Amino acid sequence: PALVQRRKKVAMIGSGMIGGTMGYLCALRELADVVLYDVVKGMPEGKALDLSHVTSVVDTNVSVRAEYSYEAALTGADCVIVTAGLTKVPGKPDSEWSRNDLLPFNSKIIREIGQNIKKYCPKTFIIVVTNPLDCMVKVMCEASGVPTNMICGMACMLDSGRFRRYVADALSVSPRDVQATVIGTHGDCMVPLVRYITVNGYPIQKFIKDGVVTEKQLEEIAEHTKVSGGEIVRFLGQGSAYYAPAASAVAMATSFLNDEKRVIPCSVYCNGEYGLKDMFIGLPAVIGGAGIERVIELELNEEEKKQFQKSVDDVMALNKAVAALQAPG
Amino acid sequence: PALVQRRKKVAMIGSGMIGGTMGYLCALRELADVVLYDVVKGMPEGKALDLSHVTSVVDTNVSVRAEYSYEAALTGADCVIVTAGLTKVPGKPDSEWSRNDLLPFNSKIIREIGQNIKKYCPKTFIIVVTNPLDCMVKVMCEASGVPTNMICGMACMLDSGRFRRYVADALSVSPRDVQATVIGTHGDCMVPLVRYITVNGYPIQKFIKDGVVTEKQLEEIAEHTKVSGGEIVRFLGQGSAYYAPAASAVAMATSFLNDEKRVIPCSVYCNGEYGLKDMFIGLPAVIGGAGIERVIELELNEEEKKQFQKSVDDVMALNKAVAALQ
Amino acid sequence: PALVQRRKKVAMIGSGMIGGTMGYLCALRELADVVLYDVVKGMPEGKALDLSHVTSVVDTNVSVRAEYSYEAALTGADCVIVTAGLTKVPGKPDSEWSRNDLLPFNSKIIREIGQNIKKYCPKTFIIVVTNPLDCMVKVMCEASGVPTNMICGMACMLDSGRFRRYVADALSVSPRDVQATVIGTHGDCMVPLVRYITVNGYPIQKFIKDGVVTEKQLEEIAEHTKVSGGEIVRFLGQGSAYYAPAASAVAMATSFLNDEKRVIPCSVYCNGEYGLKDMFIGLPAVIGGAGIERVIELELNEEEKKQFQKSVDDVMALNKAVAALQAPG
Amino acid sequence: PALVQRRKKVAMIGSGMIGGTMGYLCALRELADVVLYDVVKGMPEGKALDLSHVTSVVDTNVSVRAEYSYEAALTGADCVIVTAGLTKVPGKPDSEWSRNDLLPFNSKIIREIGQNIKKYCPKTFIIVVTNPLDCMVKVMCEASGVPTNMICGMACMLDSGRFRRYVADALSVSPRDVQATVIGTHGDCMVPLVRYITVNGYPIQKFIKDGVVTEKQLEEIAEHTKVSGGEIVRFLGQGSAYYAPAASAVAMATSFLNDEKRVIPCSVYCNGEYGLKDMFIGLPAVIGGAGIERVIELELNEEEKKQFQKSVDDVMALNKAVAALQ
Ligand SMILES: NC(=O)c1ccc[n+]([C@@H]2O[C@H](COP(=O)([O-])OP(=O)(O)OC[C@H]3O[C@@H](n4cnc5c(N)ncnc54)[C@H](O)[C@@H]3O)[C@@H](O)[C@H]2O)c1
Ligand SMILES: NC(=O)c1ccc[n+]([C@@H]2O[C@H](COP(=O)([O-])OP(=O)(O)OC[C@H]3O[C@@H](n4cnc5c(N)ncnc54)[C@H](O)[C@@H]3O)[C@@H](O)[C@H]2O)c1
Ligand SMILES: NC(=O)c1ccc[n+]([C@@H]2O[C@H](COP(=O)([O-])OP(=O)(O)OC[C@H]3O[C@@H](n4cnc5c(N)ncnc54)[C@H](O)[C@@H]3O)[C@@H](O)[C@H]2O)c1
Ligand SMILES: NC(=O)c1ccc[n+]([C@@H]2O[C@H](COP(=O)([O-])OP(=O)(O)OC[C@H]3O[C@@H](n4cnc5c(N)ncnc54)[C@H](O)[C@@H]3O)[C@@H](O)[C@H]2O)c1
Ligand SMILES: O=C(O)c1nonc1O
Ligand SMILES: O=C(O)c1nonc1O
Ligand SMILES: O=C(O)c1nonc1O
Ligand SMILES: O=C(O)c1nonc1O
């Protein structure tokens, strides 16, 4: 008979660690059919088979397939999560790992992906993961031409997740009940909002007064959060983090697909917020069936605005750089 | 084959609406084996059968059984959730529904149950649901003799859930990301903490300034929260709320069984907080594998202190009343 | 701002025990927005509020609303689950409880609901629960006018669920791994297929031969399966089963909404299978995004056919009777 | 104060692709605290951090830690899943990938792990993943000394899952409703039981007559099932499958931890089944809180017996070789 209820379809443009991991989450939760795309042939087919096998093991039913062309991968995609790109620059020490160094390597790739999205699934919801995150979201937006509410970058939910895990451990509570947020550009200038930490809505200041945690401790946690990415890179030796990044991107995708209207900080288009225009940066936002339904503007104090400004300078510098060096075509 | 990993066991003392609903959640999530106990003959066996059938439907495997003796029901229970008692006073108009009026009807029941827990499962974690909640938790504590960290009353998670749902609707966000809390005695004097409302940790104040919600609107939400129980009582015509109450109690039991350390407001033992002693009252707490592992003493503003004092007078009056009834 | 991913909507026509319970499952699993409808004023609103509160407790976000008009309740409904109707004949002792006795009390109600679906949501997938099940499914089909693949009745999954739980207990295995099926009409003539019982595909016969279970034990399990409904009715005192019935109906709706293609025995339209035409009866079927995508025809032996023919005669007799007494409007 | 409900603990001995992936499943489902152990220093701490971050993202609370020593990794482990070892022989072409060739490379590693399990967590449930599986499970059994019912090898649930996925696609149904089983030795001689294929208990035979699938197609599916591991190895270029293997091992661990009593084909200790003794081989089993609670000995036809004998010869040769090596 005629198909009335079509499963959601999520296209993983880039089938590396994060791409495969996100595909895993979709199969495990029967969230949507999955398509794995990558310039590397063979590997996506291997992961697609492995993942298809998972559905039987966990008693779920979604189709996991590798697609070789942009057309086959992107057509019909309800959401496109882009992880295509390099994680580390060849020959550079792990101690010098920087997301900004990936700019000259990933700009072209992201732009091309965006051009194909415009061509095959202009009505999709785009979740960019590729670094330098905030810069790549803007490139993707320009290239894909999708409405600004239909594109965002995953980063701050990951950064906040780290922030929350550390706070949760310090307070001996589930991270579910720790509301800790990191805003700004995903990089060395990200801004963990220590002043805004709450335990189920209760100000962190109360736990300082109670003698459970110290201000010093919280700032060390903020610092740890800022450098958590490099910490993992150095520990792993090869590649970078993927389990939390994948879980974060899928949580965002799920909030869109199920119109959950979850409040998740992510790289979103600024049209006046915090004083920013025509650019993307990590901010608290509401993700619903209409994409980014709201950008939350927090009341920042002097020091926070100073930190945020440095975060802004980081991404703005990268945005002018990319524009200056961009090929006409 | 010697058993190494024994499933958790949850005894539902009271197999009415809430008891059966909690058994449902256990079966649906394969959380633990379930024992349905009740004074009523037959009904528990019916619900136990129905629930056991659920395991096949949803592909889980837990044992749901009815037990009519305190010994069979309580022995080996990792957690005991008590809902036994009346929901409404006979002949009392729905418009006059008051949890406090249930005192003389449920006080002896709770005491008896506590005495049996003391006898059959003194190491269990007790979650009281029966009203008047905060007063009954103390009665249960006195009768069961369990350590103060191993007994609490489900109430404020329900009140907070309502508070959160209303706020969630007003802001158009998932209630998962609304942290709203109600503390104090579960009744007309419960205390919704409007001031502490956060949206994923972001102060509700900025949302007010942004025009998403008004202060009047929030106060209305707080009032709606306080009278949500009666609202449902009147809509249903018979009995009272059970879906949210059941989910709240199981969420608490789950945080204990899996040592999650969730921050959940509930009726906990006061060891001096706010100057309160030898009583139970709704406060934010941390539920873990060691039971109540933390009780949060939030700073209250003038209005909150006034409202909290009234909440305290309410439960203290109840406790005085039960003491005189024993 | 424009909505791209709209949540699925399930309408509970009948907000009694099963209706409310199904709404609970939807809110608990964030499966879809829920609408509770019932001729009884007040109660549906109390339950909708209770259920809306659950979403907060379990951290999900679906809308649960009571609607008192057929239009508000049915419009936009991706799936409609009908439980509206009587559970027991007033005055009749529990020892004589019979689903067929409910025919004169529920036939008109089901027809009316069908007429409303035809008007407000002709593209919906209808799941009938109201007894007498198989006859009500036909009345609903004739009244709603939906394609035969877009309507079925929940019953056999419940009967099979009981069958499975009893076998699982006898074998000391999870019922997930017990494939036991009951076919035919949901009533005293239902047919528990003992010969077809399998433990993860392994035939029950081997377990008898190896002395794990006896022939009498399985017979008692089949009998118990047949009378389970009356058993619960007599135990409860008031009303009938609702926890497993609700979970069964929702499992069916979920297979449809998520195009899972689960194989679930339910009351489906027969177009030649088992030699039956223009009628609904409990049979194994595949529920997917296109509704009933396949009706499985099992090879029945002599005794099974004899039992099945009895269930067929039961529903055929009721079908002729209901049609003869049907009010033209 | 005192902990009454302790979370389960699963130790991942080997933190490579599969070890990390199983840790992911535990964190995602809040199944148990996780310990990641590996000979490679640094990497496990990296994955542990990454996984701990996941708990915040998905709102769960389990501890994920890397442990340098066997003592810290094994002590208190309710279940130990072993994936330590090589995936392919250095320098060997992908077209020549064979699990049996890994024998000399992993046998010593498995034995050492077993001795440490005996020392630090003798009461744990051991799930071996390391190839050559069936041989390695026996090595693990002899070295660990755990009860015969407290050790098994994950493999057939994976082979069966593949078998089920292919059949599910051919029939257009959810694999949840396809019961397809592969028994024997995890390798080129594994035995997909085509004759036992059922669709929710309905014989595949009828589906063949109905023309949904042909006998020749089912045989092609059986062959594909047998060579699925190599197919993935060749596609990936480096390493081998890990998503389904991880999910299979954890499904098994969960059936044990929650005493689900699921029927999962796995490498189990033989006490005469098929005339097999003192060895492990893939057979249908029941995994509950008491470990392997039942081994199902299916009736096989002539062809299946022939294929099964080859499967037996395969592992017997391996065990014979192992005994000669160490
Ligand atoms: N925003 C965040 O918080 C966050 C977190 C982790 C990683 N990242 C970034 O995500 C990206 C992917 O990370 P990963 O761990 O999956 O890396 P990975 O190396 O495992 O996978 C990247 C994949 O991209 C593919 N690729 C390269 N060029 C391509 C092209 N032109 N078209 C299609 N595919 C192409 C590669 O072949 C490779 O399979 C990196 O750029 C990394 O820095 C961001
Ligand atoms: N704390 C809260 O937030 C909250 C929320 C909802 C309801 N409640 C209270 O929970 C209680 C139960 O509510 P319900 O909806 O399940 O009611 P219910 O009437 O459906 O069930 C109560 C059950 O208690 C049983 N019972 C009575 N006396 C007993 C005894 N001596 N021993 C064992 N069982 C006995 C009854 O037979 C009945 O089955 C009520 O007292 C109600 O006021 C509290
Ligand atoms: N197929 C099965 O396996 C199965 C299993 C259980 C129950 N059932 C049947 O399901 C039906 C409902 O069971 P229940 O336990 O929920 O019963 P219930 O009595 O709790 O609820 C029935 C609800 O139907 C409502 N109703 C009556 N007439 C209506 C109308 N014209 N329009 C809208 N609502 C109307 C009633 O007001 C009541 O709230 C019964 O007929 C029962 O026999 C079938
Ligand atoms: N049974 C099955 O169905 C099945 C399925 C897939 C893989 N496997 C087998 O599982 C094993 C692991 O596969 P993988 O994909 O995780 O491989 P992998 O290479 O990703 O991980 C193996 C890990 O083992 C560690 N290791 C090596 N020697 C060790 C030692 N002495 N002590 C502790 N750790 C040690 C390595 O450092 C590495 O991190 C392989 O042997 C593979 O053949 C079995
Ligand atoms: O934040 C990280 O861990 C990260 N890893 O690769 N890119 C990143 O941003
Ligand atoms: O709060 C409620 O809804 C309630 N219903 O019965 N007792 C209660 O406390
Ligand atoms: O089968 C049952 O339990 C039942 N209860 O009410 N109607 C039914 O069919
Ligand atoms: O079966 C597989 O896919 C496999 N991959 O590595 N070892 C194995 O057994």
PDB file of N, CA, C and O in Angstrom, chain A residues 1-8 30 59 61 78 123 149-150 176 256-261 289-290, chain C residues 1-5 7-8 30 59 61 78 149-150 176 256-261 289-290 292:
ATOM      1  N   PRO A   1       0.869  -1.198   0.000  1.00  0.00           N
ATOM      2  CA  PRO A   1       0.000   0.000   0.000  1.00  0.00           C
ATOM      3  C   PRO A   1       0.898   1.237   0.000  1.00  0.00           C
ATOM      4  O   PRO A   1       2.123   1.118   0.077  1.00  0.00           O
ATOM      5  N   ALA A   2       0.289   2.418  -0.071  1.00  0.00           N
ATOM      6  CA  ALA A   2       1.040   3.671  -0.078  1.00  0.00           C
ATOM      7  C   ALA A   2       1.597   4.010   1.305  1.00  0.00           C
ATOM      8  O   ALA A   2       0.897   3.900   2.311  1.00  0.00           O
ATOM      9  N   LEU A   3       2.856   4.432   1.347  1.00  0.00           N
ATOM     10  CA  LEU A   3       3.502   4.784   2.606  1.00  0.00           C
ATOM     11  C   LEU A   3       2.922   6.074   3.169  1.00  0.00           C
ATOM     12  O   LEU A   3       2.974   7.124   2.527  1.00  0.00           O
ATOM     13  N   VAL A   4       2.363   5.985   4.371  1.00  0.00           N
ATOM     14  CA  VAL A   4       1.770   7.142   5.026  1.00  0.00           C
ATOM     15  C   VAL A   4       2.757   7.749   6.022  1.00  0.00           C
ATOM     16  O   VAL A   4       2.942   8.963   6.058  1.00  0.00           O
ATOM     17  N   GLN A   5       3.387   6.898   6.826  1.00  0.00           N
ATOM     18  CA  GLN A   5       4.348   7.362   7.824  1.00  0.00           C
ATOM     19  C   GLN A   5       5.769   6.983   7.420  1.00  0.00           C
ATOM     20  O   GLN A   5       6.196   5.848   7.611  1.00  0.00           O
ATOM     21  N   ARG A   6       6.495   7.941   6.859  1.00  0.00           N
ATOM     22  CA  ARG A   6       7.865   7.711   6.418  1.00  0.00           C
ATOM     23  C   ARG A   6       8.830   7.998   7.563  1.00  0.00           C
ATOM     24  O   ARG A   6       8.717   9.019   8.241  1.00  0.00           O
ATOM     25  N   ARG A   7       9.778   7.098   7.784  1.00  0.00           N
ATOM     26  CA  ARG A   7      10.755   7.287   8.847  1.00  0.00           C
ATOM     27  C   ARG A   7      11.564   8.541   8.563  1.00  0.00           C
ATOM     28  O   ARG A   7      11.703   8.955   7.409  1.00  0.00           O
ATOM     29  N   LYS A   8      12.087   9.159   9.615  1.00  0.00           N
ATOM     30  CA  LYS A   8      12.913  10.334   9.422  1.00  0.00           C
ATOM     31  C   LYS A   8      14.195   9.815   8.778  1.00  0.00           C
ATOM     32  O   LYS A   8      14.514   8.626   8.885  1.00  0.00           O
ATOM     33  N   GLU A  30      16.381   3.703  17.173  1.00  0.00           N
ATOM     34  CA  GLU A  30      15.414   3.628  16.084  1.00  0.00           C
ATOM     35  C   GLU A  30      14.910   5.039  15.807  1.00  0.00           C
ATOM     36  O   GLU A  30      13.725   5.256  15.562  1.00  0.00           O
ATOM     37  N   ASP A  59      16.916  -5.077  18.502  1.00  0.00           N
ATOM     38  CA  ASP A  59      15.515  -5.155  18.105  1.00  0.00           C
ATOM     39  C   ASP A  59      14.894  -3.845  17.625  1.00  0.00           C
ATOM     40  O   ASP A  59      13.827  -3.446  18.092  1.00  0.00           O
ATOM     41  N   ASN A  61      14.311  -1.184  13.955  1.00  0.00           N
ATOM     42  CA  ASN A  61      14.293  -1.285  12.507  1.00  0.00           C
ATOM     43  C   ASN A  61      14.411   0.043  11.778  1.00  0.00           C
ATOM     44  O   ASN A  61      13.441   0.787  11.635  1.00  0.00           O
ATOM     45  N   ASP A  78      16.013  14.704   6.263  1.00  0.00           N
ATOM     46  CA  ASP A  78      15.284  15.586   7.175  1.00  0.00           C
ATOM     47  C   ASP A  78      16.288  16.455   7.922  1.00  0.00           C
ATOM     48  O   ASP A  78      16.003  17.597   8.282  1.00  0.00           O
ATOM     49  N   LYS A 123      15.656  22.206   2.101  1.00  0.00           N
ATOM     50  CA  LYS A 123      14.692  22.343   3.194  1.00  0.00           C
ATOM     51  C   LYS A 123      15.114  21.552   4.431  1.00  0.00           C
ATOM     52  O   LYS A 123      14.355  21.428   5.387  1.00  0.00           O
ATOM     53  N   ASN A 149      17.423  29.897  10.542  1.00  0.00           N
ATOM     54  CA  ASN A 149      16.905  29.111  11.659  1.00  0.00           C
ATOM     55  C   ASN A 149      17.043  27.616  11.376  1.00  0.00           C
ATOM     56  O   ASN A 149      16.833  26.787  12.260  1.00  0.00           O
ATOM     57  N   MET A 150      17.410  27.275  10.146  1.00  0.00           N
ATOM     58  CA  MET A 150      17.546  25.873   9.756  1.00  0.00           C
ATOM     59  C   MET A 150      18.985  25.378   9.733  1.00  0.00           C
ATOM     60  O   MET A 150      19.295  24.360   9.119  1.00  0.00           O
ATOM     61  N   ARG A 176      22.412  15.398  35.192  1.00  0.00           N
ATOM     62  CA  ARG A 176      21.098  15.747  34.659  1.00  0.00           C
ATOM     63  C   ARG A 176      20.638  17.000  35.394  1.00  0.00           C
ATOM     64  O   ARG A 176      20.023  17.890  34.806  1.00  0.00           O
ATOM     65  N   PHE A 256      14.938  18.586  17.163  1.00  0.00           N
ATOM     66  CA  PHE A 256      14.351  19.141  15.950  1.00  0.00           C
ATOM     67  C   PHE A 256      13.315  18.164  15.384  1.00  0.00           C
ATOM     68  O   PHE A 256      12.159  18.529  15.157  1.00  0.00           O
ATOM     69  N   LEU A 257      13.736  16.918  15.174  1.00  0.00           N
ATOM     70  CA  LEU A 257      12.862  15.889  14.612  1.00  0.00           C
ATOM     71  C   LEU A 257      11.599  15.630  15.431  1.00  0.00           C
ATOM     72  O   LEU A 257      10.532  15.388  14.866  1.00  0.00           O
ATOM     73  N   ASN A 258      11.720  15.679  16.755  1.00  0.00           N
ATOM     74  CA  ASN A 258      10.579  15.451  17.641  1.00  0.00           C
ATOM     75  C   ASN A 258       9.974  16.750  18.166  1.00  0.00           C
ATOM     76  O   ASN A 258       9.107  16.721  19.039  1.00  0.00           O
ATOM     77  N   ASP A 259      10.432  17.884  17.643  1.00  0.00           N
ATOM     78  CA  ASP A 259       9.941  19.189  18.091  1.00  0.00           C
ATOM     79  C   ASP A 259       9.865  19.230  19.618  1.00  0.00           C
ATOM     80  O   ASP A 259       8.828  19.575  20.194  1.00  0.00           O
ATOM     81  N   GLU A 260      10.972  18.883  20.271  1.00  0.00           N
ATOM     82  CA  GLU A 260      11.015  18.855  21.731  1.00  0.00           C
ATOM     83  C   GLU A 260      11.143  20.232  22.361  1.00  0.00           C
ATOM     84  O   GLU A 260      10.731  20.437  23.502  1.00  0.00           O
ATOM     85  N   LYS A 261      11.726  21.162  21.614  1.00  0.00           N
ATOM     86  CA  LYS A 261      11.945  22.519  22.095  1.00  0.00           C
ATOM     87  C   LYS A 261      12.883  22.500  23.302  1.00  0.00           C
ATOM     88  O   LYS A 261      12.671  23.202  24.298  1.00  0.00           O
ATOM     89  N   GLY A 289      10.660  21.946  16.130  1.00  0.00           N
ATOM     90  CA  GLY A 289      10.308  21.497  14.795  1.00  0.00           C
ATOM     91  C   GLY A 289      10.502  22.557  13.728  1.00  0.00           C
ATOM     92  O   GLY A 289      10.424  22.264  12.532  1.00  0.00           O
ATOM     93  N   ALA A 290      10.737  23.793  14.157  1.00  0.00           N
ATOM     94  CA  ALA A 290      10.964  24.890  13.226  1.00  0.00           C
ATOM     95  C   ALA A 290      12.432  25.298  13.289  1.00  0.00           C
ATOM     96  O   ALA A 290      12.788  26.427  12.951  1.00  0.00           O
TER      97      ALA A 290
ATOM     98  N   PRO C   1      10.897  30.011  11.648  1.00  0.00           N
ATOM     99  CA  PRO C   1       9.587  30.093  12.332  1.00  0.00           C
ATOM    100  C   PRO C   1       8.574  29.065  11.824  1.00  0.00           C
ATOM    101  O   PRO C   1       7.734  28.592  12.587  1.00  0.00           O
ATOM    102  N   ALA C   2       8.657  28.728  10.539  1.00  0.00           N
ATOM    103  CA  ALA C   2       7.757  27.749   9.934  1.00  0.00           C
ATOM    104  C   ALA C   2       8.058  26.342  10.451  1.00  0.00           C
ATOM    105  O   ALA C   2       9.214  25.916  10.487  1.00  0.00           O
ATOM    106  N   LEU C   3       7.013  25.620  10.843  1.00  0.00           N
ATOM    107  CA  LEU C   3       7.172  24.263  11.363  1.00  0.00           C
ATOM    108  C   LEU C   3       7.558  23.297  10.248  1.00  0.00           C
ATOM    109  O   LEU C   3       6.911  23.253   9.198  1.00  0.00           O
ATOM    110  N   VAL C   4       8.616  22.527  10.484  1.00  0.00           N
ATOM    111  CA  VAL C   4       9.098  21.560   9.508  1.00  0.00           C
ATOM    112  C   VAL C   4       8.855  20.136  10.004  1.00  0.00           C
ATOM    113  O   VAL C   4       8.439  19.266   9.239  1.00  0.00           O
ATOM    114  N   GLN C   5       9.118  19.906  11.288  1.00  0.00           N
ATOM    115  CA  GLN C   5       8.915  18.593  11.888  1.00  0.00           C
ATOM    116  C   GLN C   5       7.776  18.649  12.911  1.00  0.00           C
ATOM    117  O   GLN C   5       7.986  19.021  14.065  1.00  0.00           O
ATOM    118  N   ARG C   7       5.067  17.022  15.398  1.00  0.00           N
ATOM    119  CA  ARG C   7       4.973  15.804  16.196  1.00  0.00           C
ATOM    120  C   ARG C   7       3.801  14.969  15.716  1.00  0.00           C
ATOM    121  O   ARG C   7       2.822  15.499  15.187  1.00  0.00           O
ATOM    122  N   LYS C   8       3.897  13.660  15.908  1.00  0.00           N
ATOM    123  CA  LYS C   8       2.810  12.784  15.518  1.00  0.00           C
ATOM    124  C   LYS C   8       1.683  13.071  16.505  1.00  0.00           C
ATOM    125  O   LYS C   8       1.935  13.523  17.625  1.00  0.00           O
ATOM    126  N   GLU C  30       7.378  10.026  24.978  1.00  0.00           N
ATOM    127  CA  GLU C  30       7.388  11.190  24.095  1.00  0.00           C
ATOM    128  C   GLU C  30       7.086  10.721  22.678  1.00  0.00           C
ATOM    129  O   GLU C  30       7.677  11.197  21.706  1.00  0.00           O
ATOM    130  N   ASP C  59      10.779  14.200  32.063  1.00  0.00           N
ATOM    131  CA  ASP C  59      11.552  14.997  31.120  1.00  0.00           C
ATOM    132  C   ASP C  59      11.267  14.782  29.636  1.00  0.00           C
ATOM    133  O   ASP C  59      12.192  14.635  28.839  1.00  0.00           O
ATOM    134  N   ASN C  61       8.552  16.024  26.204  1.00  0.00           N
ATOM    135  CA  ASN C  61       7.705  17.137  25.823  1.00  0.00           C
ATOM    136  C   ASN C  61       6.729  16.782  24.716  1.00  0.00           C
ATOM    137  O   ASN C  61       7.083  16.726  23.538  1.00  0.00           O
ATOM    138  N   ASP C  78      -2.728  11.319  13.407  1.00  0.00           N
ATOM    139  CA  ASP C  78      -1.981  10.351  12.616  1.00  0.00           C
ATOM    140  C   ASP C  78      -2.503   8.953  12.889  1.00  0.00           C
ATOM    141  O   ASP C  78      -2.452   8.075  12.029  1.00  0.00           O
ATOM    142  N   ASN C 149      -6.334  -1.409   4.639  1.00  0.00           N
ATOM    143  CA  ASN C 149      -5.001  -1.545   5.225  1.00  0.00           C
ATOM    144  C   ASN C 149      -4.744  -0.497   6.303  1.00  0.00           C
ATOM    145  O   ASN C 149      -3.757  -0.582   7.035  1.00  0.00           O
ATOM    146  N   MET C 150      -5.635   0.481   6.410  1.00  0.00           N
ATOM    147  CA  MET C 150      -5.475   1.550   7.387  1.00  0.00           C
ATOM    148  C   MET C 150      -6.327   1.379   8.635  1.00  0.00           C
ATOM    149  O   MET C 150      -6.559   2.330   9.375  1.00  0.00           O
ATOM    150  N   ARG C 176      10.220 -12.047  25.810  1.00  0.00           N
ATOM    151  CA  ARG C 176      10.722 -11.442  24.577  1.00  0.00           C
ATOM    152  C   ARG C 176      11.106 -12.585  23.649  1.00  0.00           C
ATOM    153  O   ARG C 176      10.934 -12.508  22.430  1.00  0.00           O
ATOM    154  N   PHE C 256       3.357   1.512  13.343  1.00  0.00           N
ATOM    155  CA  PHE C 256       2.809   2.261  12.218  1.00  0.00           C
ATOM    156  C   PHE C 256       3.504   3.613  12.072  1.00  0.00           C
ATOM    157  O   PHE C 256       4.020   3.947  11.005  1.00  0.00           O
ATOM    158  N   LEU C 257       3.511   4.385  13.153  1.00  0.00           N
ATOM    159  CA  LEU C 257       4.107   5.713  13.152  1.00  0.00           C
ATOM    160  C   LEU C 257       5.587   5.732  12.786  1.00  0.00           C
ATOM    161  O   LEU C 257       6.045   6.645  12.098  1.00  0.00           O
ATOM    162  N   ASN C 258       6.331   4.725  13.236  1.00  0.00           N
ATOM    163  CA  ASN C 258       7.760   4.640  12.955  1.00  0.00           C
ATOM    164  C   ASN C 258       8.120   3.649  11.851  1.00  0.00           C
ATOM    165  O   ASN C 258       9.292   3.321  11.665  1.00  0.00           O
ATOM    166  N   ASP C 259       7.112   3.183  11.120  1.00  0.00           N
ATOM    167  CA  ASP C 259       7.310   2.228  10.029  1.00  0.00           C
ATOM    168  C   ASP C 259       8.296   1.136  10.429  1.00  0.00           C
ATOM    169  O   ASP C 259       9.275   0.876   9.729  1.00  0.00           O
ATOM    170  N   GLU C 260       8.021   0.493  11.560  1.00  0.00           N
ATOM    171  CA  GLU C 260       8.886  -0.562  12.077  1.00  0.00           C
ATOM    172  C   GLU C 260       8.707  -1.889  11.350  1.00  0.00           C
ATOM    173  O   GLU C 260       9.653  -2.661  11.213  1.00  0.00           O
ATOM    174  N   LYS C 261       7.487  -2.153  10.903  1.00  0.00           N
ATOM    175  CA  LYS C 261       7.174  -3.391  10.201  1.00  0.00           C
ATOM    176  C   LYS C 261       7.234  -4.576  11.165  1.00  0.00           C
ATOM    177  O   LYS C 261       7.726  -5.651  10.825  1.00  0.00           O
ATOM    178  N   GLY C 289       4.621   1.660   7.993  1.00  0.00           N
ATOM    179  CA  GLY C 289       4.220   3.010   7.642  1.00  0.00           C
ATOM    180  C   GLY C 289       3.083   3.078   6.647  1.00  0.00           C
ATOM    181  O   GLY C 289       2.530   4.155   6.409  1.00  0.00           O
ATOM    182  N   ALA C 290       2.738   1.938   6.056  1.00  0.00           N
ATOM    183  CA  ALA C 290       1.647   1.874   5.090  1.00  0.00           C
ATOM    184  C   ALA C 290       0.475   1.124   5.717  1.00  0.00           C
ATOM    185  O   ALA C 290      -0.397   0.614   5.012  1.00  0.00           O
ATOM    186  N   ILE C 292      -1.387  -1.923   7.487  1.00  0.00           N
ATOM    187  CA  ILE C 292      -1.230  -3.372   7.432  1.00  0.00           C
ATOM    188  C   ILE C 292      -0.603  -3.657   6.072  1.00  0.00           C
ATOM    189  O   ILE C 292      -1.260  -3.547   5.034  1.00  0.00           O
TER     190      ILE C 292
END
